[model samples]
Target: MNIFEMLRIDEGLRLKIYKDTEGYYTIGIGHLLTKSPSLNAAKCELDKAIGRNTNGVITKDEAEKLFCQDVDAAVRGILRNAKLKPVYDSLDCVRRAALINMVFQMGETGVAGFCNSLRMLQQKRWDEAAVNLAKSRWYNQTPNRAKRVITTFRTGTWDAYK
Candidate 1:
């Protein structure tokens, strides 16, 4: 399953967040939307949606509290609006996850902002993608993280983690 499914955020949750919420927000750890009765019901629904175990509970409030809605929005926005279909469609599970994680952390604009790099990747230009990925602002911002992730993208060997 895709990361969204793994995360228990199917179309319903996606639609809710997209249609109802104003903009990017946060869902904290132990948030509670309402008092006992309502909170209990909301929590039950969330638990089912997220497939949380008995020991794992997150109130609707908590979901909001623990999650950075803006980041969430950014992720959704990239998946929904970016020119990443080719890249995503061409990548493997691990690579997809790595890219999504990077995009999520970087924001949709930031992710899609990798225009030249994406063009390179689309052209099967592995070396260029590697170079662009490394020369990115993200790279300059966090060399270690960039190096590790970019190495994975370049090598396709899954040894970057090592």
Candidate 2:
């Protein structure tokens, strides 16, 4: 499966606005509405995304559209990082997907802070990178997702997508 399908499974579908684990307003497969500079800007952007004023609800198609947009932004963020771009480009699609997925959940800055992990990944030290991932706060917060990404890194395959 592609990165979109993989992320869809991990993030899940949400058509209605709800609070995330951190208690911020979120919607549409993990889109952080409250973090958009301001709540007014967030509502306006959400309305624009849904192509109309929304009473905090959207269709599956609209959610998927927003999901794709967020995923692309994550990919772009990773590629735009000078330290990550070369390593991202050198990996196969499966490994690349794992990196993008991590970036998606953690944000580019968060993932970039994993200096040892990034170094191991850049050096093609798959097992070491997986270990680094497992030791992070993210693993404690979302063990299942972290496990899948860690397995993907270690194996260099999409077997963890299951």
Candidate 3:
């Protein structure tokens, strides 16, 4: 049988809710479960698993594999956003990279929740889009990062500091 099928046998299925060994809200073949997107804090979850600092735990290889998978999925999610259709293709690679960053911080659904900002982006209204982005919960949570995205959305620069 396949590895996944093997896992299915080893890590028995739990159709109902249950906790994992470390008390993590887990279900299925040992996959972490999240009831709502609000509690689906990706960074926090990753931190809980891998720890914030290196601490000589987990090799760079493992970290790269996980991060790469996450980044790829995040980029795909941003690409699937219909509202970004208008300016998505027009933006330079750097701007698109910024979008990926935003998507990574705020999951696909979370970033899509920025209806007003998205509409502004669709219309190519850089100024308004920038203001709208800066005036978001995501922005409030990460001012420095928000500024960099806002500046790039308004201007065509990648100055995360500015």
TM agreement with the true structure for every prediction: 0.54, 0.90, 0.60
Q: What TM-score would you give candidate 2 relative to the actual structure? A: 0.90
Residue 45 shift from truth in candidate 2, angstroms:
4.7
How do the residues 113-144 of candidate 2 rate in per-residue lDDT, one tens digit apiece? 88888889888999888898798899998899
Better of 1 and 2 by lDDT: 2
Clashes of each: 14, 0, 0
Q: What C-alpha lDDT do the candidate models reach, one value each?
A: 0.54, 0.84, 0.58
lDDT tens digits, residues 82-161, model 3?
75544457667666666666675557888877888877776778899888888787677667657766776777564543
**Model 3 lDDT, full chain set:** 0.58
Kindly indicate the candidate among 1 and 2 with the higher TM-score. Answer: 2
RMSD of 2: 2.2
lDDT per residue, candidate 1, 9-70, as tens digits? Answer: 31123212121121222123222222334434554645554566422334554454334553
Error (Å) of candidate 1 at residue 42 is: 23
TM-score of 1: 0.54
